[PDB]
Each structure stands twice: as structure tokens, then as C-alpha cells.
Amino acid sequence: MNKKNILMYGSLLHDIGKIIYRSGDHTFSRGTHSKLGHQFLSQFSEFKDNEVLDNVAYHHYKELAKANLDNDNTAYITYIADNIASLFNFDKYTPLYSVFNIVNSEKLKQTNGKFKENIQYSSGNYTTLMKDMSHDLEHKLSIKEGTFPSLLQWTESLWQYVPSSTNKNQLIDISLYDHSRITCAIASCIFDYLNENNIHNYKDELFSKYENTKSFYQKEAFLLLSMDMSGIQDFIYNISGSKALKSLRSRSFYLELMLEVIVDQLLERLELARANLLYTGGGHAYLLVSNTDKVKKKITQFNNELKKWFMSEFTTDLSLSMAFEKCSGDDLMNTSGNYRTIWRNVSSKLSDIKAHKYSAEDILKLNHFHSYGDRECKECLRSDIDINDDGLCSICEGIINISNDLRDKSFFVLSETGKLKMPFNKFISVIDYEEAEMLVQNNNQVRIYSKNKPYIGIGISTNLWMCDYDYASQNQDMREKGIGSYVDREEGVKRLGVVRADIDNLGATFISGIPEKYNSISRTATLSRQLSLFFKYELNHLLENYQITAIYSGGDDLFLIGAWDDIIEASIYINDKFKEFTLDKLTLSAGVGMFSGKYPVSKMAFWDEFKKNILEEKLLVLQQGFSQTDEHGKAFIYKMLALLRNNEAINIARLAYLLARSKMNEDFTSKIFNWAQNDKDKNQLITALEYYI
Amino acid sequence: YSKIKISGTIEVVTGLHIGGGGSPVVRDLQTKLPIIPGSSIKGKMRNLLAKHFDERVLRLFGSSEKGNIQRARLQISDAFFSEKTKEHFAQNDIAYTETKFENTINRLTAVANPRQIERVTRGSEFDFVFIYNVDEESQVEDDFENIEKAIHLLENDYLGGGGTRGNGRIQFKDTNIETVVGEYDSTNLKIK
Amino acid sequence: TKVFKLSFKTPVHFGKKRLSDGEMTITADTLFSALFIETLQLGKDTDWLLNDLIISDTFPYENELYYLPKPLIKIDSDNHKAFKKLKYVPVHHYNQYLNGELSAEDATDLNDIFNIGYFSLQTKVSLIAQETDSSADSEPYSVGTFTFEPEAGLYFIAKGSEETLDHLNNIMTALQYSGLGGKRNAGYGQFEYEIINNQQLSKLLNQNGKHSILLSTAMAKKEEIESALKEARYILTKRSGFVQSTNYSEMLVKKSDFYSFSSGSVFKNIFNGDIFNVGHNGKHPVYRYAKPLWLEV
Numbered sequence A: 001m002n003k004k005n006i007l008m009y010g011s012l013l014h015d016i017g018k019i020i021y022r023s024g025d026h027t028f029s030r031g032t033h034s035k036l037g038h039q040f041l042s043q044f045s046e047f048k049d050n051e052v053l054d055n056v057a058y059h060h061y062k063e064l065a066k067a068n069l070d071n072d073n074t075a076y077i078t079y080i081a082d083n084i085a086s087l088f089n090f091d092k093y094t095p096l097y098s099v100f101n102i103v104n105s106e107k108l109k110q111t112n113g114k115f116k117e118n119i120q121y122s123s124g125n126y127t128t129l130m131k132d133m134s135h136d137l138e139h140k141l142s143i144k145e146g147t148f149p150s151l152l153q154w155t156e157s158l159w160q161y162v163p164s165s166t167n168k169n170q171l172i173d174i175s176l177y178d179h180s181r182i183t184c185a186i187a188s189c190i191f192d193y194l195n196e197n198n199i200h201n202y203k204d205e206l207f208s209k210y211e212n213t214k215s216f217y218q219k220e221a222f223l224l225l226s227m228d229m230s231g232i233q234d235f236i237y238n239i240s241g242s243k244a245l246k247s248l249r250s251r252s253f254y255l256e257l258m259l260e261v262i263v264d265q266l267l268e269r270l271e272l273a274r275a276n277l278l279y280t281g282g283g284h285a286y287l288l289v290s291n292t293d294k295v296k297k298k299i300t301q302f303n304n305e306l307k308k309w310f311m312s313e314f315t316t317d318l319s320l321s322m323a324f325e326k327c328s329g330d331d332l333m334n335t336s337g338n339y340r341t342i343w344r345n346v347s348s349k350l351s352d353i354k355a356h357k358y359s360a361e362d363i364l365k366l367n368h369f370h371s372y373g374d375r376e377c378k379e380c381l382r383s384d385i386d387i388n389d390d391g392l393c394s395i396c397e398g399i400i401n402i403s404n405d406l407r408d409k410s411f412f413v414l415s416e417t418g419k420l421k422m423p424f425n426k427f428i429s430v431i432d433y434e435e436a437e438m439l440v441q442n443n444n445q446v447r448i449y450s451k452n453k454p455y456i457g458i459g460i461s462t463n464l465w466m467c468d469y470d471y472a473s474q475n476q477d478m479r480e481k482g483i484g485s486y487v488d489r490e491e492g493v494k495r496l497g498v499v500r501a502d503i504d505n506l507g508a509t510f511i512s513g514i515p516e517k518y519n520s521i522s523r524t525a526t527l528s529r530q531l532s533l534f535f536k537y538e539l540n541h542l543l544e545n546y547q548i549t550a551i552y553s554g555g556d557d558l559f560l561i562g563a564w565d566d567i568i569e570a571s572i573y574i575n576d577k578f579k580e581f582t583l584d585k586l587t588l589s590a591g592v593g594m595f596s597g598k599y600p601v602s603k604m605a606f607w608d609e610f611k612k613n614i615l616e617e618k619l620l621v622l623q624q625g626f627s628q629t630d631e632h633g634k635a636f637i638y639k640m641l642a643l644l645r646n647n648e649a650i651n652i653a654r655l656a657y658l659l660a661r662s663k664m665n666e667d668f669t670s671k672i673f674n675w676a677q678n679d680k681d682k683n684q685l686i687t688a689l690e691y692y693i
Numbered sequence B: 001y002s003k004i005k006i007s008g009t010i011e012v013v014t015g016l017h018i019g020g021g022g023s024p025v026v027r028d029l030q031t032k033l034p035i036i037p038g039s040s041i042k043g044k045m046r047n048l049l050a051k052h053f054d055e056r057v058l059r060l061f062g063s064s065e066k067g068n069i070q071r072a073r074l075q076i077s078d079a080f081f082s083e084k085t086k087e088h089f090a091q092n093d094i095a096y097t098e099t100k101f102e103n104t105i106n107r108l109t110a111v112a113n114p115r116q117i118e119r120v121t122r123g124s125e126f127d128f129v130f131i132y133n134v135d136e137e138s139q140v141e142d143d144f145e146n147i148e149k150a151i152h153l154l155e156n157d158y159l160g161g162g163g164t165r166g167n168g169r170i171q172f173k174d175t176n177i178e179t180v181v182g183e184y185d186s187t188n189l190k191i192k
Numbered sequence C: 001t002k003v004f005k006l007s008f009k010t011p012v013h014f015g016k017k018r019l020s021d022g023e024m025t026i027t028a029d030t031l032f033s034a035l036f037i038e039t040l041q042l043g044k045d046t047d048w049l050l051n052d053l054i055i056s057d058t059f060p061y062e063n064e065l066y067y068l069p070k071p072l073i074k075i076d077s078d079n080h081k082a083f084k085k086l087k088y089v090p091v092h093h094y095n096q097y098l099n100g101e102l103s104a105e106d107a108t109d110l111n112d113i114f115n116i117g118y119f120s121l122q123t124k125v126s127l128i129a130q131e132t133d134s135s136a137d138s139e140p141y142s143v144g145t146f147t148f149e150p151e152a153g154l155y156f157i158a159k160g161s162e163e164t165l166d167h168l169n170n171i172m173t174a175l176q177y178s179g180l181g182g183k184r185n186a187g188y189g190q191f192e193y194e195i196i197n198n199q200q201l202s203k204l205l206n207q208n209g210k211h212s213i214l215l216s217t218a219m220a221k222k223e224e225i226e227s228a229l230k231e232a233r234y235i236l237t238k239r240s241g242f243v244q245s246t247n248y249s250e251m252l253v254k255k256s257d258f259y260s261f262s263s264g265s266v267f268k269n270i271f272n273g274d275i276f277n278v279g280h281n282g283k284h285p286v287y288r289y290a291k292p293l294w295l296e297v
């Protein structure tokens, strides 16, 4: 095995024993963490690699003090990676705490929430988890150079909520998955930095003296790389056709898959692991790669080829930016909040390199093409593009095809023939688990991208996180339907509802984080991943009771389209559910409008009071009154509106007479009149009754 | 070269219903006073004139789609309430826009389902301006004769919706013809 | 160097990609195009008003206050949020902004007070199809229009010799009765203009500094672009569209795509633009205006 693969395998599994120690039930768990993991990884033939066993068994200080390991070995790198990732009585039943409550505990510290109110863990659960991981290591897992991604996938599948540390005196909020993953990434960066820099006596380099330990911690060893997608909000919103909804699901997925394939391809260039991707979502991406001249030259070269390709295909609609700024180990360990300083520096460099995107020769090259081309794509507003059959260009027709395939098939493959044009001379098509399996046994250089499917274990397992929900597929016809399937609802006016939401307090959350005590790279990674999981899984389950279709979900943007009533109800419900998930630490800013059917969805797109007072009190009163008393349709309510909108006392006296003439229960009339007499209550009343129609 | 301005006012003999919202009527989203889009005027004149006869109708409005290209020669502009009507209605305390109630009879069933429609008040006055661009000297008399014929047909027809049902009849008054660019005499031209 | 005030009183459609898009200001390309077509229609000569005149983009104004585009200067903080939401900076506070004297709360107040118009969609149909005779769908379509408050509008920046300015004033007198936007013949886009001098705008336009703020849409000529981009903060904007009376088929004639810097870019090496030709397979040349109008601070 290549020493790098040995290093990742050791690093990811150094603290594997902690779960079993916390298990307690089994006869293995009687001894300390390191040796425990040692005999446990020796139980399986595939993981019988001796060096990985050593890395696991010698991942802390006391063991290494007597470890008599060779002057060069990956174990020391693993030690340092765990240290940088990070009186000592560990409680085996410690539950994982949500970081979100800690994020805004400075303004209002509320009872800290714990995962599974005062929830406590049971050692039986740990026994069950150990049996599950024994099963995986026994049948599902096997060590090959290409299986490391599968190992990562199973680790994420199992450990994503078992706490990493269980110190009673420490504010535990790191899952073992996070700590292990960041350890793997950091260790890989260390290995590249030391090897390229022509140092081999790593024991002497770092283990020798504590002064050198702080010294290497201080040396600029890491590089923090950030990527930004230029024009998503424009290119996604040039849709006006009748099949608009099908494309939007296909277009957001197209940009998402672009970002995913480009980041994966980058990580392939770096000969590096997938654990190195700290955050993806929206048009952003964050990586922690090795700080080597080799790394920098590769990044620059790939940037050049990348910019070439996008200029070749869209030339203004989509562009990508690269930026990186040096960082050291001392920075990541949250010494003096300099983590936030470097985070802002990399953000600033990314945001000012976008100013200069085109060199001279490129800008000249653009302006002189008297090239014979056809005219704008109907579905996709682009002059430069050339249409074909039925007035559609190639890109949007492939978008239509993959949209057709989206609802039925769950797996997407990265293949060299495929359907949709993709950065690195590649194409994406759709597959099922069985032909994906055959592709795996076809030893083809493929990357299966899945639709929120765990326990796949198929080749390069990539449980891509995405919310693809559509109520139109819940009808008698499984085939995807047009926008009219939601317009034609008879329970109210035949219109459409649209909601957009952004976390208002997000810039500080990723930047400021938890101040002065928890701004570690580990905890930022945990925060980012938890936000990603919420905005990429929970929405899909929440939407199941609404006639709404998920369009753009991920990052901090939420885009749902459907019936007017269902959109409002789902917006309120998701607002409440999010307030639960962030424990009322993060809020939502949203706006909902009403538009007629088949309007260009491009232009379709360009809290407590509303629930308690309007929807719950006045709306229910009005609904009960209008249901009990007949003959009072939109005409009577519209006369109500004419009297209420024109805020004059003459209208109020007229409304008094109108309620005298109306045949409701006197309570309804009195309440309505007295609501109309207050400005706030009259506005709430008009809003509710407008909702009625 | 010269430009000719046609300016005046139009009255609704019976109520008008353009109704872009539909049952609302077109308004300005802030002033809320109703208008008359120039597209309605242009389209009704073009339909009536074409149906009164394809070179002259091509010449006035311009098609420029049939392999031969003609620039439009007569430009219509939108309309707004006259100040006179606003003053008059404010003094007399008259609502700007009425709301007529209607029904429909189901055969074999004879149960009526109601209907609500919004209608511009009778007797209002709108202000309109036409711009004519004389590009051929020897054609102005014929073109203005044709536009007079179009006005004549429009006076005897309807604008907007439900015209056969009894709304949209209009009338033209206070029309003057003034040259504003160039040196073409516009005193021998008439539009009634 | 005069400015030209514009008040509209009728909705205007200005357009980016389709008719149902609405836009507030217009670029120097369409402005010069309108001036040139009006000149040709009037039959006077184009040589005078081709290679002497410099036109700046249109910018909005309110009751008594004028506006300019946001400079793309690197303000070193970190909010980067309230300022990203700002699009136009009032003239009274321009030099304050370029010296980093604008506070976040003042920026929020400016964003609050910046109401100078609203957007609308009017739906329209077309019964020219078989509908008139046989069962055929009426075809609905929408146009994007934008309206001003009674005390708002757009204004120009123009400069050149006095004779060219007189010719420009004559042409604008002619032009106030054609349109300045999209569906000119469908009832949109007539204006009244007025010539005004502003003491504050004058002082701003004749300042002296080291940087430069581009107020038009320009592209450097081939041999000067290399030195132009030594230290530049800019964004490119694609400009395409069809052409008026170049060959038989309008739907076969389409101008070549062109790219030019936006109206807020900052440069260190001043360059002179040119009226680039964007024609091919045509009977008469078609022009696009790319010539800068700098303000030095």
C-alpha cells in the first residue's frame, strides 16, 4: 500500500476505540482506548495492515513515549493531526450537544440541547453500533486503494452523532465523525508538507522538544482554498417555457453537480482525500490543502484550464474564482481568534479577485468572432448559444432529458460518453443500483452520485445531499407534470405560491462562530455540516404534506413553489421546525408572492404575529362565520375590502350598517367591527380575509 | 423632414373595460387612476382598417415581418384622466369606477351563477396624443383620410371587453393638428 | 459640458433579454443608437456627431437630488452586506463615499430613501392569428415597464465643442417625440427634456485625483487594452441584440456579440475608446458606442 493510503487509513481510525469503551458490555472494552482499537482492527483480514494498526494504537502521548517506533512513521503525523483537531474523566453516556445553541448563547444562554430535553445515551446503543460496524468491516468493507471513499461513506453513515470527546468539564459538541474526518484531512496535509519539503526524520522534526512542537505549530504548513461560482442567480432564472418546473429542478441540480464534479476532480489532482472538503453549498466551496509550491502550481494550472472551459461554454453566464491564503497550525487551533482573521482574509481575496477575471488576450479573443451562429434558446435565454430542433439548444435539451430521468432514477454517473456536457471532458447520465453494480464490476472509472441514499456501497459511494421533492409525482401518474398540475387546484384561486428564505445571521455564524473559546476548525466544520444536513434532508421530509416542489435547496437558500395556501402553511411550519433545530438561535427572512400560472418562472422568482393573530385567530373566526352563514361570497368580502382599504369614518359607519344587515352570529359581527376599528387589527383582518378568497 | 402631433381627448359614452388584471381594470399601481393602454387603441384601429378593405395598413402601423420591412409611421401613446374630470368628480363626490353585477342562466337548470365586473365610470375624459412621422410628401393626405376612416369606425364600435354586451362605446372631441418638428403645414388636415 | 434632464410621465420599457423584463436606466449604446437613428431620419449629417461627441450613461434623479453609480473601490473594513445592497450614491455624499466616510446606518438610510420608481407587468394579447376567423388561441404576452414618481426621471452627461453641443440639443428636440426604449410604437417611452446646470455636479466633474470612475460603457481599442488593465477593478457586460433595417430578414439579422466594461469600473491608465463596428453580411455599417467619460477622483 502507498504510504499515503496507509496514513489516511490510520488517521481516520485512531480514536475508533472510544465507542467500544463507551459500550462497556463486551469483554473487549476493559482496557484503554488505543490498545482496544488495536485488537478490534486486528479482528478483520482486510484491515490486517500492520502500519494502520500501529497508527491506531499509538495515537496519544503516553503510548508514543514508549512506542519505540521507527524514526519515520505515519503515527507521529496522526498524533499531531489529532492534537490540532482538538480532569479527564470520560463519561460513557455523554450525549452530543448541538453547536447552534452555543452559537448565540452569548446574547441569550438557553438550556443546552442534547441529542439521542435531558436526553442520555445508553451503553446498549454502543453495543449495537459496534455490532453494526463489525458487520460492515466483515462483509461490506475491504481495503483497496479506491475503497477509502467507501470507508469514509460508512464512517459518516454510522458515527455522525456519537460524541467524539466525553469530558465532563468540556463543552462537548464534536461528533466522532467530525473529529476523525478533520484528523484525516489535516494528517494528509501534514504528510504532503513534510514529504515535499524533503524532511524525513519527522520524530526529530516534531516529537523531539515541546519548543519545536509549538514551532511547527507556528510554521505556515497549510493552505486554505476557497471557490466561488459567479452567476448562479442569473443563469438559473432565465426560464420562461411551459416545462419550466422540470428544468428548474434540473438546473439547480445541474449547477450543484457541476460544483461537485469540479471539486472532486480538483481533489483528484491533489492526489488527496475527500475528507479535505470542509464545506460545499450554493456557489461556494472551502478546502484545506497542503501548503506546497507543487500544490500551488497545480491549483494555478487547473484554474487556468477551468477558466478556459467556462469561457468556452457560457462566457459570461457562469464563471468560477480561485483564491487561497496561507495559514499555520497555530491559526487553526484557535489561539487568539486569528481563525476569524484568516477566514475574512480568504473571503476578501476571493471577493476582490472576481474584479479581475479576464486577461488582455482573452478579452481581445472574445470580441473578434464573426462566427455563424443561430439564435436564443427558448428555455435558456442566451444569444451566444445556438438552437436546434424545436428551437432548443443541446444544453437545455439534455437538461430536459435528465429532468425526465430525475424523478424515477436515483443514481447519476460520471461517464465519458453520457448526456450532459460537464467540465473535464466528461458527461453525466442516470443509472440504477443494478447497472451501477455492473459498472463497478466493469472496473470503469466511474463516480456514482446518488439521491440521498445511504447503505449503497457501490463503487465510489457518493451520498450526494440534495432535496428533490415534487408533489406532482404523488398523483396517479408517476411522470413529471407541468406547472398546471399545481395551478388547477380548485380550493381557492388558480394561482401559484413561491417562497424564498435566507438565514439572516449566517455571515457571522460561519465567520464569527462561537467566540473566543470554540472557534476551532473542527467546530466550524461541525457547524457547517449540520447546517448542510438540515437544508438538504429535513426539508424533504417536512414537505411531504404539501402540494409543493423543491427547486433550489442548499447553502442558505430555500426555494419552494406550489399552491398559495400550501406555500404559506409550509413556510410557517418550516420556520417553526428550523427554530427547533437551531433551538431558536438562527432566524429566517422570507417573502411570498402570488402570480398567475405559466408565468416565466424566471420572473416568478426575481412571524409569530402572522401565525397567532392572523392565521389562527382572525382567519379561523372568519372561516367559521362564512361557513355557518351562506350567500356571502367574494362580493360581500370585496365590499368589506372597499370599506376597509379606504380608511375613512364614512366607510366605518357603512361597515356598521353592513354588519347589521349581515346574518352572522352577533359575536362575529361585533368582533369584526371592533377589529376594523383598530389600525393593526384592521390590517390583520384584511390580510386574513384576503387569504380566505 | 417633419413631425405632426395629433392631440385631443376621448370620452366614454358607456363604460369602458380594458381589464388587464382580469375582474379588475388597468390602473397605475400607485396613483390607482385608470388609464387606456395604447396597444388597445392601435390594435382596434388596425383591425378595423384592415377589415375595411394590404399596402396602406402596412404603411401606417408597419408589419416588418413578411420579408419586406416597413417602419411604423404613426405612434400611439397611452392615455390618462383629464384634470377636468378629476376636478368635476371631486367636487361632485363621485367614485372613479363602478362595479356592475351580472349572472348567467344554465339551460335545463335555470340556476344563475353570479358575476362581478369592474367598469370605468361613464362620462370620464381621457387625454391622448398621436405622433405622425411624414416620410413621403405625396402620401400625407391619403394617410390622414385613412386615419379619419379608422376614427369613424372606432366611434361606431367598442374598445375593450364585452363590446357586444353593451360597453366600450367611445367618442372623440377637441382634436387639434399641430406640427412640432419641421416645416409642414398641418392646418388643412382634419380628424372628427 | 451640459446635462440634460429627462421627465417621462409615461411608462417606459427598456429591456435586457425579453420584452417582459423591466430596467430603470439605459446604457450609452442605446442612447447613441437612438441619437444616430434620429439623425439619419432627420437627414442631417452624421460625421459631426460621430467622432467628436462624448456621451455618459443615463442616471436617475429624485425631487432635487441627483445620483451616480457606485464606484467599485476596495473599501477596507467587516460588513460587506449593506454596501453590496447599495446601487446608487447621491452626489452630496459622493466624495464622502470615496474617502470611506459613509457609515452603515447612513447607508441603510440612503437605501430606505432611494425610492424613485416601481416595476409593473401589463399583459397583452394578439388576435392577429386565425382567432379572427376560426377557433384559435389568443396568444397572451407580457411587457416589463417601469414608472417614476411625478418628481423623478433620468439625466445625461454630455461634453464636446459648443457646435457639437448645439447639434445635440437640436437632435434631442427632435427626439423627445420618438422613444427611448422598447415598444416605442406600442405606447411607451415619450419624454420632455430640459437643460440644467448644477454647481455641485460641475465641481465633481472637474475635480482632480489619481483614480478614475468610468461613467459610460467602453472598450479599449486593440493596441491600448494591454496597458489599460494594469490595475483595474471592472465587470464586463455582454451586449447583444438585433438591428433595424440592415437586410431583408430581421430574424436573420443579429448584431455580433460585444463586450464592454460597465459604468462603475475604476481604472489607473486612461484610454480612449472607439465606435466599434459590429456588422457583417450587411448593406450599411452598424455602430456601437464605446467611448469613456471619466471623473477624476
Ligand SMILES: Nc1ncnc2c1ncn2[C@@H]1O[C@H](COP(=O)(O)OP(=O)(O)OP(=O)(O)O)[C@@H](O)[C@H]1O
Binding pocket: A228, A229, A230, A231, A232, A233, A234, A236, A251, A252, A253, A254, A255, A256, A281, A282, A283, A284, A552, A554, A555, A556, A557
Ligand atoms: N445550483 C443552484 N441553483 C439555484 N440557486 C443556487 C444554486 N447554487 C446556489 N444558489 C443560490 O443562488 C444564490 C445567488 O448566487 P450568485 O449568482 O449571487 O452567486 P454567489 O455564489 O452568491 O456568489 P457571488 O454573488 O459573490 O458571485 C447563491 O448565494 C445561492 O444561495
Ligand SMILES: Nc1ncnc2c1ncn2[C@@H]1O[C@H](COP(=O)(O)OP(=O)(O)OP(=O)(O)O)[C@@H](O)[C@H]1O
Binding pocket: A279, A281, A282, A284, A502, A503, A504, A505, A506, A507, A510, A527, A528, A529, A531, A532, A555, A556, A589, C081
Ligand atoms: N451550511 C453552510 N456552511 C458554511 N457556510 C455557509 C452555509 N450555508 C451558507 N454559507 C455561507 O454564509 C454566507 C452568507 O452570506 P449571504 O449574503 O448569502 O447571507 P447573509 O449575509 O446572511 O444575508 P442576510 O444577512 O441579508 O440575510 C454565504 O456566503 C455562504 O457561503
